[PDB]
Scaffold this active site. Structure first.
Site, short mmCIF file in Angstrom:
data_model
loop_
_atom_site.label_atom_id
_atom_site.label_comp_id
_atom_site.label_asym_id
_atom_site.label_seq_id
_atom_site.Cartn_x
_atom_site.Cartn_y
_atom_site.Cartn_z
N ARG A 54 0.73 -1.22 0.21
CA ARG A 54 -0.20 0.10 -0.04
C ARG A 54 0.71 1.44 0.01
O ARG A 54 1.59 1.73 1.09
CB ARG A 54 -0.76 -0.18 1.14
CG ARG A 54 -2.42 0.58 0.99
CD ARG A 54 -2.34 1.86 1.50
NE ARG A 54 -3.15 1.67 2.78
CZ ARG A 54 -4.45 1.85 3.07
NH1 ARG A 54 -5.13 2.24 2.04
NH2 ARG A 54 -4.87 2.20 4.04
N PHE A 59 2.04 10.92 1.02
CA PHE A 59 1.58 10.24 2.24
C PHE A 59 2.75 9.19 2.84
O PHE A 59 3.54 9.50 3.62
CB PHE A 59 0.36 9.94 2.01
CG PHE A 59 -0.52 9.24 3.33
CD1 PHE A 59 0.27 9.45 4.69
CD2 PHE A 59 -1.72 8.36 3.42
CE1 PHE A 59 -0.54 8.89 5.89
CE2 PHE A 59 -2.28 8.02 4.26
CZ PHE A 59 -1.65 8.17 5.60
N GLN A 62 3.67 1.67 2.77
CA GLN A 62 3.20 0.76 3.55
C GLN A 62 3.92 -0.74 3.14
O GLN A 62 3.43 -1.08 2.13
CB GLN A 62 1.93 0.79 4.07
CG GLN A 62 1.47 -0.14 5.22
CD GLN A 62 0.09 -0.01 5.52
OE1 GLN A 62 -0.52 0.91 5.59
NE2 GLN A 62 -0.71 -0.94 6.22
N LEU A 121 -1.01 11.74 12.58
CA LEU A 121 -1.13 10.17 13.20
C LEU A 121 -0.37 10.22 14.48
O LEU A 121 -0.07 9.23 15.05
CB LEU A 121 -0.25 9.37 12.18
CG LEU A 121 -0.91 9.09 10.66
CD1 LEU A 121 -0.06 8.43 9.67
CD2 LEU A 121 -2.37 8.45 10.83
N1 LIG Z 1 -0.64 -5.85 12.86
C1 LIG Z 1 -1.79 -5.09 11.57
C2 LIG Z 1 -1.27 -3.87 11.28
C3 LIG Z 1 -1.91 -3.37 10.32
C4 LIG Z 1 -3.23 -4.13 9.82
C5 LIG Z 1 -4.00 -3.50 8.61
N2 LIG Z 1 -4.43 -1.97 9.10
C6 LIG Z 1 -3.94 -0.82 8.50
O1 LIG Z 1 -3.41 -1.07 7.31
N3 LIG Z 1 -4.23 0.23 9.05
C7 LIG Z 1 -4.00 1.40 8.33
C8 LIG Z 1 -2.42 2.02 8.98
O2 LIG Z 1 -2.14 1.40 9.93
N4 LIG Z 1 -1.99 3.10 8.02
C9 LIG Z 1 -0.66 3.77 8.38
C10 LIG Z 1 -0.43 4.97 7.54
C11 LIG Z 1 -1.19 4.43 5.96
C12 LIG Z 1 -2.55 3.64 6.81
C13 LIG Z 1 -3.74 4.56 7.20
C14 LIG Z 1 -3.57 5.15 8.35
C15 LIG Z 1 -4.35 6.00 8.55
C16 LIG Z 1 -5.53 6.74 7.42
C17 LIG Z 1 -5.40 5.98 6.30
C18 LIG Z 1 -4.33 4.98 5.90
C19 LIG Z 1 -3.49 -5.41 10.26
C20 LIG Z 1 -2.60 -5.79 11.29
#
Ligand SMILES: Nc1ccc(CNC(=O)NCC(=O)N2CCC[C@@H]2c2ccccc2)cc1
Length: 164
Positions: A54, A59, A62, A121
């Protein structure tokens, strides 16, 4: 001092180069130690072979879902999920290394590298490091992302490890 680790990254089988990260063990030792061990592969699993699944321009990039490859999995060296260590470090600009999550206290292996200040964040995602070299490599990764996060080429961590 704080460990240095590397990721070597390909885009559709063509090398982009190397990203070198400082892990801030002195502020977030647990979170830092997780990433380190996942770079070395010393627990018998880790980031080698996995993808940046991702990527959104202006931004972040990931990666780190080495169990399911789709953004749903990953696991830490402590078990599948572990708590938010602290929020002392902030998302201060490009090159910040931070933990992806699915809500409070759900750190696994997924991580992101910021390409801008993501101060919204702060208090949400545990920052645990910074790019030391290869921010140009991160910009190339970024150039294969999109508004949605869906990448235009397959972005692969072909190799990774500990330098110091
Ligand atoms: N252990 C684990 C960690 C993450 C996930 C999936 N969650 C995710 O991808 N959440 C979003 C996230 O963490 N981020 C970090 C920056 C990009 C994206 C995000 C955050 C806030 C808004 C839009 C995207 C499943 C299991």
């Amino acid at each position: 001092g704080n460990p240095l680790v590397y990721l070597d990254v390909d885009a559709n089988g063509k090398p982009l180069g190397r990203v070198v990260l400082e892990l801030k063990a002195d502020v977030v030792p647990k979170t830092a130690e997780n990433f380190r061990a996942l770079c070395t592969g010393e627990k018998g699993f880790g980031y080698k072979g996995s993808t940046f699944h991702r990527v959104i321009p202006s931004f972040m990039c990931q990666a780190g879902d080495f169990t399911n490859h789709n953004g749903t999995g990953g696991k830490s060296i402590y078990g599948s999920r572990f708590p938010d260590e602290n929020f002392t470090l902030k998302h201060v600009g490009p090159g910040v290394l931070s933990m992806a999550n699915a809500g409070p206290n759900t750190n696994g292996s997924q991580f992101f590298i910021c390409t801008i200040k993501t101060d919204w964040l702060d208090g949400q995602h545990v920052v645990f490091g910074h790019v030391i070299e290869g921010m140009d490599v991160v910009k190339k990764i970024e150039s294969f992302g999109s508004k949605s996060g869906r990448t235009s080429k397959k972005i692969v961590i072909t190799d990774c490890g500990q330098l110091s």
